[PDB]
Amino acid sequence: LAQQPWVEKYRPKNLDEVTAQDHAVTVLKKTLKSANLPHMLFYGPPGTGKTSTILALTKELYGPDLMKSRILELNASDERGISIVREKVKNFARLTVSKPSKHDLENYPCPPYKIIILDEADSMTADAQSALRRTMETYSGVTRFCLICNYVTRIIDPLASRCSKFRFKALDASNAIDRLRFISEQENVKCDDGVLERILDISAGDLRRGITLLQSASKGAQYLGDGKNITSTQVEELAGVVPHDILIEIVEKVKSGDFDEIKKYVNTFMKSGWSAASVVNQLHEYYITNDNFDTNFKNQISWLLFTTDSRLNNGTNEHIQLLNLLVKISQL
């Protein structure tokens, strides 16, 4: 048998199965009641159910059988660029709509149009979005577009004006933890207390990344072979997250302020293989949200962390950048 990711395995089938998007679900139901479906713009925090809801809407529109013949799922972050995506969209639109069978027509509305689902639309440049708008207005009769993005403000005004916008609220921590617990119970995954909370915290509330991390942790636990429960250290290891003890030791070494001690500790730390970017991110999280530091210290350390992150994003030596960042923080 084939293997399927848990993200696509536990997608809601129909609109009624979406938990914490009642406003968008109601608006989409009202639109579905109308015979005409306009272009749609699904925007909100990542991992809230945008793709799940559009897939459920498509399944209700076309039926489980005709759905695969009416959908072109594309990603705007394709490395091949604008030309390949636009050519694929044009080829999909040019092809005539497949004729539904009698069963599909009698059991489902089967609207004449075909739905194109484009993901990460906000990552497109202005020229790409203008070309997409030209294609949309060219084939508006046959193809209806659905743009999925995290920030509606990244989409140009001419393209955004043509799309009815649905805003998805960020999932409540209770709802996300309940969904993760249900998935773990269905998949027979043993977890200790607070493991799902740690997974959600690492994923920063993104339920997609949380489900992916849970599946990876389940695979790792199966490979462990002892049958014991998944622990927080395992999920931290699989996500590339530095343990809190090492971060506390880094903080103490910075607080002491001795240059030689900090250099020695950084040299020792670079031998353990932990990612420096994760260290910078966790240091930012620790220092910014700490009540024991005044406004001036945070003002300086935000710029310090920003400069270190900008230099790290350029593909530089992690040891030098980390040592410089720690030394600069220790001087505050």
Partner 1 sequence: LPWVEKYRPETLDEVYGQNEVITTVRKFVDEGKLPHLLFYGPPGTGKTSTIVALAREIYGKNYSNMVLELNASDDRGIDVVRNQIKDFASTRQIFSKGFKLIILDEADAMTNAAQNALRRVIERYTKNTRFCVLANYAHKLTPALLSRCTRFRFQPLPQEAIERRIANVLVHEKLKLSPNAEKALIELSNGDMRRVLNVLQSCKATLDNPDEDEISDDVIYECCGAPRPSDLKAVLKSILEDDWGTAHYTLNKVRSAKGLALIDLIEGIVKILEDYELQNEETRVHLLTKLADIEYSISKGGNDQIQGSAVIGAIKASFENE
Partner 2 sequence: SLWVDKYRPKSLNALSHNEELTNFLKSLSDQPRDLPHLLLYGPNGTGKKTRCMALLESIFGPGVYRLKIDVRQFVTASNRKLELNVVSSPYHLEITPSDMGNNDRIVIQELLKEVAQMERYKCVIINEANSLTKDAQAALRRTMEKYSKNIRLIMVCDSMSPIIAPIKSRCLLIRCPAPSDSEISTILSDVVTNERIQLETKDILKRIAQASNGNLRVSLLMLESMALNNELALKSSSPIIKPDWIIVIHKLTRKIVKERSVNSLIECRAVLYDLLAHCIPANIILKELTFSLLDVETLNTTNKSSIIEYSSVFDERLSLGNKAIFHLEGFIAKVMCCLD
Scanning 9-17, 19-27, 149-157, 264-272 for contacts with partner 2 by CB under 8 A, the matching segment is 264-272
Q: How far is the CB of 329 from ligand ADP (least distance, A)?
A: 34
Of 39, 50, 59, 70, which one interacts with ligand ADP (CB under 6 A)? 50
Residue in 144, 142, 180 with CA at minimum distance from that of residue 57: 144
Taking CB under 8 A as the rule, does residue 6 contact partner 2? no
In which element (H, E) is residue 167 found? strand 164-167
Alpha-carbon Rg of the chain, whole angstroms? Answer: 24
Q: How far is the CB of 254 from partner 2 (least distance, A)?
A: 13
Q: Which tokens in the block code for residue 212?
A: 């992916």
Cβ proximity of 175 and 181 under 8 Å: no
3-state SS assignment for residue 75: strand
Please name the residue that has the structure tokens 């500790």: 265
Show the site string, 33-62: x = touches partner 1 by CB under 8 A, - = not: --------x-xxx-----------------
Scanning 15-23, 41-49, 179-187, 212-220 for contacts with partner 2 by CB under 8 A, the matching segment is 212-220
What residues are designated binding site for ATP? 7, 11, 44-52, 150, 208
Q: Binds 224, which of partner 1, partner 2, ligand ADP, none (CB < 5 to 8 A, cut-off by type)?
A: partner 2
Question: What single DSSP character describes residue 230?
Answer: B
Which one, 106 or 226, has the nearer CB to partner 2? Answer: 226
Which one, 22 or 237, has the nearer CB to partner 2? Answer: 237
Q: Binds 292, which of ligand ADP, partner 1, partner 2, none (CB < 5 to 8 A, cut-off by type)?
A: none
Which one, 8 or 285, has the nearer CB to ligand ADP? Answer: 8
Show the site string, 308-327: x = touches ligand ADP by CB under 6 A, - = not: --------------------
Please name the residue that has the structure tokens 């998944």: 230
Please name the residue that has the structure tokens 């805003």: 167
Taking CB under 8 A as the rule, does residue 324 contact partner 2? yes
Taking CB under 6 A as the rule, does residue 59 contact ligand ADP? no
Q: Binds 306, which of partner 1, partner 2, ligand ADP, none (CB < 5 to 8 A, cut-off by type)?
A: partner 1
Taking CB under 6 A as the rule, does residue 10 contact ligand ADP? yes
Q: How far is the CB of 21 from partner 1 (least distance, A)?
A: 13
Q: How far is the CB of 317 from ligand ADP (least distance, A)?
A: 34
Taking CB under 6 A as the rule, does residue 135 contact ligand ADP? no
Find the Cα–Cα–Cα–Cα dihedral 203, 204, 207, 209, rounded to 10°.
-30
Please report which residue ranges of 257-294 form alpha helices under DSSP H: 259-270, 276-288
3-state SS assignment for residue 191: strand
Cβ proximity of 104 and 110 under 8 Å: yes
HSE-CB at 228 with a 13 A cutoff on CA atoms is: 5
* Cβ contacts of 174 within 8 Å, gap of 6 or more: none
Which string of DSSP letters, residue by residue, matches 40-58? EEEESSTTSSHHHHHHHHH
Residues in contact with ligand ADP by CB under 6 A are: 7, 10-12, 18-21, 46-52, 148, 179, 207-208, 211
